[PDB]
Nucleic acid binder design. Structure first.
Ligand SMILES: NC(=O)c1cccnc1
Length: 208
DNA sequence: AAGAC
């Protein structure tokens, strides 16, 4: 059976993504990504989105494969003013860290009741690219690196050190420059015109 | 363009 690494190679996956409010970025670039449970245990300040955590795994960090969860992301941009950023993360996390793989949002009733052990591993990862995910039929032109359902999720049950963050995307140049000054060894990227296909876009538009 | 229960 194919390994996680083999699937990455075959599908041309190059990026994992994690959106977050800019309020969190200093702390993430300093300390790495941490779960809600761990931030609470360390008494670290953070700005979270979800007030329910219906997934049931507050000790896990949520990532996306190849494109952010543009639906949940846009919701929280409407609800929380200020700049949002998108962390780009090495696909190596998928094998190097303790990951569970979900073909849709990890809070969905379609996936959250399954034995967590069945969601680890290459078989669970391959399911993110299935021809039909709980009624979403994969488009025949969707490129190989994209999940069938834009909300497909990775839950990472340990910390992600900042060396796995390969770049960070900003919604304006000033935001990127601010963080570049503070973190000169890191890559801080930005869009000048947000009227464009950007990682802030819905995926169907981005790939259109 | 607005998850999840
Ligand atoms: N922060 C994230 O990128 C995220 C959160 C919830 C679901 N999928 C991704």
């Amino acid at each position: 059976s194919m390994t996680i690494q083999e699937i990455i190679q075959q599908r041309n996956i190059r990026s994992l993504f994690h959106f977050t409010h800019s309020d969190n970025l200093t702390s993430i670039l300093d300390n790495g990504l941490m779960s809600r449970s761990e931030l609470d245990n360390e008494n670290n300040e953070y700005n979270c989105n979800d007030e329910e955590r219906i997934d049931g795994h507050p000790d896990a960090i949520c990532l996306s494969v190849s494109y952010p969860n543009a639906k949940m992301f846009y919701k929280y941009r409407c609800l929380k003013p200020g700049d949002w950023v998108i962390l780009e993360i090495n696909p190596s996390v998928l094998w190097a860290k303790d990951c569970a793989f979900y073909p849709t949002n990890a809070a969905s009733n379609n996936v959250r009741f399954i034995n967590l052990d069945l969601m680890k591993g290459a078989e669970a990862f391959s399911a993110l690219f299935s021809e039909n995910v709980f009624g979403i039929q994969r488009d025949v032109n969707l490129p190989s690196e994209y999940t069938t359902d834009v909300q497909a999720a990775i839950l990472v049950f340990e910390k992600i050190p900042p060396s796995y963050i390969i770049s960070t995307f900003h919604p304006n140049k000033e935001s990127a420059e601010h963080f570049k000054r503070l973190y000169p060894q890191t890559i801080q990227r930005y869009y000048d015109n947000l009227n464009a296909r950007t990682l802030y876009s819905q995926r169907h538009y981005y790939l259109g």
